[PDB]
Write an enzyme that holds these catalytic residues in place. Structure first.
Site: not given
Lengths: 155, 7
Positions: A51, A105, A123, A146, A149
């Site tokens: 990702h 990330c 998640q 977060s 994505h």
């Protein structure tokens, strides 16, 4: 569906038909992966994904705090995500390269690879999108706590 | 979320 309209579809679970504001041409949208494709599209136990994460803040801490690393807005983050999607789909950029270059990330170091996982680990929004993707397919913008994505199922 | 056309 209605007497005055052509009948239609299947659309596997998660898919819906929509219209291009630009051309009036029909296209298909998956509301789980948020991916869009022209072709009528018409689960597994473990999947491996890579990702590209773009973080954003909405925080607003007091003057005494140090400057925060992430200062862009959600809107700005979504714009970056959409641009990357366009460059990847147009073959202008490779997913792995862009992930390595811009992902916020810690996985950016591994070309975006998160490894193989099962349900219950990631998640929920991320998990649902990943398991709804076909191998080799990419998601549209997926929102989690977060950030935003772009997910590529590699296995 | 309103989706973007595929291309």
């Amino acid at each position: 569906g209605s007497h005055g309209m052509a009948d239609e579809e299947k659309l596997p679970p998660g898919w819906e038909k929509r219209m291009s504001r630009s051309s009036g041409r029909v296209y298909y949208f998956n509301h789980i992966t948020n991916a869009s494709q022209w072709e009528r599209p018409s689960e597994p136990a473990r999947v491996r994904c890579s990702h590209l994460l773009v973080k954003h803040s909405q925080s607003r801490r007091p003057s005494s705090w140090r400057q925060e690393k992430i200062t862009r807005t959600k809107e700005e983050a979504l714009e970056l995500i959409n641009g990357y999607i366009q460059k990847i789909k147009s073959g202008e950029e490779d997913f792995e390269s862009l992930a390595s270059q811009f992902s916020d990330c810690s996985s950016a170091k591994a070309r975006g690879d998160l490894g193989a996982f099962s349900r219950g680990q990631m998640q929920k929004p991320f998990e649902d999108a990943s398991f709804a993707l076909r191998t080799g397919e990419m998601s549209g913008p997926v929102f989690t706590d977060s950030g935003i994505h772009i997910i590529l199922r590699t296995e | 979320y309103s989706p973007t056309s595929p291309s």
